Amino acid sequence: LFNPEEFMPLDPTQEPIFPPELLRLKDVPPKQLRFEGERVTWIQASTLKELLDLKAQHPEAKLVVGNTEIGIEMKFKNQLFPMIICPAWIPELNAVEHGPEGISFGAACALSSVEKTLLEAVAKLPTQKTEVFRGVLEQLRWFAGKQVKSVASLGGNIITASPISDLNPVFMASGTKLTIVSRGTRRTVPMDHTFFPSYRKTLLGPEEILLSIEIPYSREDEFFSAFKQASRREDDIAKVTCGMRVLFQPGSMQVKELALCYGGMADRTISALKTTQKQLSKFWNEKLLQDVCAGLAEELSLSPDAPGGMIEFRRTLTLSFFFKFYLTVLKKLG
Amino acid sequence: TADELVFFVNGKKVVEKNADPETTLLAYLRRKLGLRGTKLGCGEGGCGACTVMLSKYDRLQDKIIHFSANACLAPICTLHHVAVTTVEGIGSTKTRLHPVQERIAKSHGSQCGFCTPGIVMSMYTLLRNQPEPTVEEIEDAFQGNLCRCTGYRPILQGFRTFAK
Amino acid sequence: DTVGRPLPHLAAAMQASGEAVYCDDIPRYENELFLRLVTSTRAHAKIKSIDVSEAQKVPGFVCFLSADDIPGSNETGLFNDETVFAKDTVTCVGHIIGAVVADTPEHAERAAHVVKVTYEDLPAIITIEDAIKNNSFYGSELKIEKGDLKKGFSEADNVVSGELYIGGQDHFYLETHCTIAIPKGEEGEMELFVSTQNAMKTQSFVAKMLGVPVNRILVRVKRMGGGFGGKETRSTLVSVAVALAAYKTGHPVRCMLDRNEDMLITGGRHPFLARYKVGFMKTGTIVALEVDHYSNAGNSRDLSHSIMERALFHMDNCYKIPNIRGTGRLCKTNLSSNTAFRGFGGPQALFIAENWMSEVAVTCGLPAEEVRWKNMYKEGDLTHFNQRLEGFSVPRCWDECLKSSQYYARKSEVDKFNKENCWKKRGLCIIPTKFGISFTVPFLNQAGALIHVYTDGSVLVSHGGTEMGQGLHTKMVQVASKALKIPISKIYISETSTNTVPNSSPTAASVSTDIYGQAVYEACQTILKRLEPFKKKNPDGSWEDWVMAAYQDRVSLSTTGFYRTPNLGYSFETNSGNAFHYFTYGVACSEVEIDCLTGDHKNLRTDIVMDVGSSLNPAIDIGQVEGAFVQGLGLFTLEELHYSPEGSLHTRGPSTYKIPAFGSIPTEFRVSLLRDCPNKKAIYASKAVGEPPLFLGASVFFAIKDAIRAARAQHTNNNTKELFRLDSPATPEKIRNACVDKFTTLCVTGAPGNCK
């Protein structure tokens, strides 16, 4: 149908040059910029101090990094935010820092930067330390495209707090640490069930910003899986997605800690706490499988009129996903 | 009391003295700069018709970086000191087509043609990052681009010639 | 002579460079305004007030338009049962109430959002079952009957009855609907640039709304960024509104829809519900078939009747059925009016047919290929509508596809996979199709062309057809070049316009190549006849020499060509006369693997063999087979529209409506055009290819069903002849739910349940 042999060869040295004038402008010391529109004022914050002063001065101010969510909100939900602050320039919100307990990402880091960094970690570290990292990567695999991942920030996903976020279930199940700051305040908290009190809300004060997110190394006797529904039929509900974690007592199959966190089963990310609390000290076997499946069926039960429908399929997935986790853990154990 | 916004498009300096924070790069390219190669397919980031390449000197990495982005969602106000490459930045029938453009055209990877610029820019960006990609990287490059006409086979087959 | 050569689409280099101009790419006039439609948020209500006070405050606001502003007529649509703008009552969620005009598209958007509407709800009908219960139909029952059903059902060893639903589909052309309307300010004259497959109707409907003769309205179409049937009539919802804004303001006005508006307002493929009963022998031989089809037509007639007629014409697929009765009813509902979508009712009825055929083979416990083959028409058989199948090539397509796809060896490997795997299963299916070529409305089977040879010898071709990506213009140049015996580089087609070829049928029914091919060819013969004396005087001269001598001798180098498809005219009263000129055939074999635990699946391999006669351009035709197949794979597996109980579309963008992606297509994807099967009935022995292959995407659906059957033998019961209902699209939800096991039943929790 065509003849490849006649194609013009590629010449990587002949590509459109990076604008030299732009290059010269890189020396210019970064400073706060102000843009004013018909409706919106945008401040481009250059320093963290600036961001925090701006946030104290205008707590109603709206952060924007990648705009992949705010843009949708403004266009399709007719929401208007008269004051927006863009912190993408701030070094602290872009810093990738290795530590004793895990890998820290500034809240502005693009999902592609997270993905690159984690792929590097996984290829280099022992499997037993990369369980949570591989979970994150599995969620990032068939997630949007290269265009969205290059601009969508890690912090933006977390704080958007969509019921169907593929990341928040993994961060909840792994107690990923969030460092949150305002003018004055600084606090790090592990993400748990209380971080998402209601629909599209997080446990932040109006003046706080998420600074950084530390995704933990996994320990000995610790295993992790993440799964997701490969169908989505509604804007922000009823797509099942999860992070699952188990810690055993040393060298054993006896449960010390267990976390099953789910998106798409409520109006926020939730933990099957009742169910998992009852498996502590239990052994990883058919009886635990039955009991977790019974607890999941009950705790995550959906009324016939639940928003998003697919009532049977969704219950089935919560159980079928745990089944995959159960078998994977047995394979990692035995 | 408002600062000037300064960015580059196809190697040329744009000095925007009255940036409205609501303005998307796609609107700017099409309706201010008159560069209509970049298309609106959805406005919500699903289709990639609006795909462009962005380049900047990253001051934290100490490096020039190139990546693809959806112009429909990129506010121009994020683009101070950023360089935009659109499909017209890389080649033209009026001069010389880029190998990316030539191969998709000649491999029958364009029917209606409305997705072709977005796909060209996804392929171009890959090659600007990895001059010698694998087949696998090539298929991955296009998770963000939809084509309703071609069934995709001929695009991948034309582009497979770039790999190894 | 490039006919039969894989010539690239002539605009392909320009499409890849971003130089090809689509409607919204046209530069704006200095004074050009923008329109945004204002649309119903209720399925069915009385309009009690429209409040524009907040929209009037938006910078750049120009005016709000509604039904009171229309100078001519507010009655529109193919059967005149629509309004341009709704007046007292709305009858679907996307129903157009008015429009905002502003100085930028951002300001039009802003102002439209803030237009407030008050309604009083009325009883709505959304589902086919709603409409059946309420007797809500357009027109009366359609029917084709042959043979003796009671006799057939008595001779049957076995009878299977059931019900089946196929969901609708959004066109998802990458370029949405778009019109620019330029008012000239003299004599009601208007020039419109439109993304439409139907310049004739656009021109008429605009004229009608304005109350001015049709000769005042000029409609031009360079190209569409995809059409797929969705631009055959529904384009006028945007064109007529923009024309009105242009009329009222005296400025040029444009509108390009956002994706969310387009999916909501402009209609899709008809969902069908079928109730069927088949009678067959223990051999698998069919003796009686009864099908009642019901389509969801939405809130106007549009093309629904013709779509249902085409469905009845295809209820046989490739199978000889001696005793047959098919009926169709159109459901009148409070949804956006549904329309043409590639296939035009054919895929729905062909799907229904393959479904009962799949159950026949399961009931008989026979291999499905064997049951299909046994029941297949032979050369020279008549259809249920008494048309003779001449040149019936499915037998050939079937054999070559079995061989080249290595079907039988792969069938063994799928069995071995299923024997070795518990929570994943493979399926494999091979399926034929036939697709009738012609408009089933006889009067649309007419085509014009207009050809000019200029004094430099360059040739300008114009024909009634529009380019939407299918490479119609490419094919028409290849045809003109072969006919005139000159290189393609001497010929050019610029665009389609109503002032060059009038009264054109829409670019539809897959017949454009065929009918414009002939009109172009005839125009070319006329030119050849006029040049013949000059060629005789100067037999060693050039084309350019002959052209100049003819000009200097005052011989006209301009002519029309016209073609009218012969011998067409099917009668429902006599069940007689040709509905189609000929048929296009094909066979596809597809293999899938499902994840029984999640419902996700992978398309492993597809092989297709298609009879496209002697291809005018194998590269374009192979492109059409691949593109149409992938749209069908979308229809049957991926794409699912979803509405609130109140009739409001939830799925309005690529985040919630999933068309096939790069990663969706079969890993090994092979297409072959059948060799040595010239078609005597069409231009240069070719056959139509647009729509015929789309149904082949169902091979994926039936491979999935095969895989599910395996999952069910594994975990749900021991009944090898069980018939479960699987509706289309077979999304993850439907696949997962059908693999009944310890999790679907909750037996895994310790409960009793309906698995083994």
Ligand SMILES: Cc1cc2nc3c(=O)[nH]c(=O)nc-3n(C[C@H](O)[C@H](O)[C@H](O)COP(=O)(O)OP(=O)(O)OC[C@H]3O[C@@H](n4cnc5c(N)ncnc54)[C@H](O)[C@@H]3O)c2cc1C
């Ligand atoms: C087409 C596409 C596909 C997608 N697919 C998926 C998917 O499969 N799974 C999934 O989980 N998500 C998906 N997303 C969502 C995507 O990951 C989020 O939209 C994105 O991460 C938001 O980040 P942003 O930087 O673009 O946020 P923005 O839109 O700029 O802001 C998001 C919100 O976070 C706030 N915010 C941002 N940074 C901070 C900060 N550091 N401190 C406090 N508040 C802050 C903002 O005020 C705003 O409310 C998809 C999005 C697109 C458009």
Ligand SMILES: Nc1nc2c(c(=O)[nH]1)N[C@H]1C(S)=C(S)[C@@H](COP(=O)(O)O)O[C@H]1N2
């Ligand atoms: N690229 C492309 N191919 C396409 C379409 C389209 O919009 N784009 N429409 C299809 C439909 S619905 C029909 S009826 C035929 C019409 O074109 P033809 O008559 O020239 O085949 O093209 C088919 N192939």
Ligand SMILES: O=c1c(O)c(-c2ccc(O)c(O)c2)oc2cc(O)cc(O)c12
């Ligand atoms: O696309 C089609 C279409 O437009 C019409 C039609 C019917 C009545 C009218 O008044 C009219 O204007 C058009 O019939 C058809 C019949 C087919 O078998 C196939 C088609 O594709 C069409």
Ligand code: MOS
């Ligand atoms: O007949 Mo094609 O326009 S559906």
Ligand code: FES
């Ligand atoms: S227009 Fe569809 S992703 Fe931007």
Ligand code: FES
């Ligand atoms: S060529 Fe038509 S959408 Fe890709």
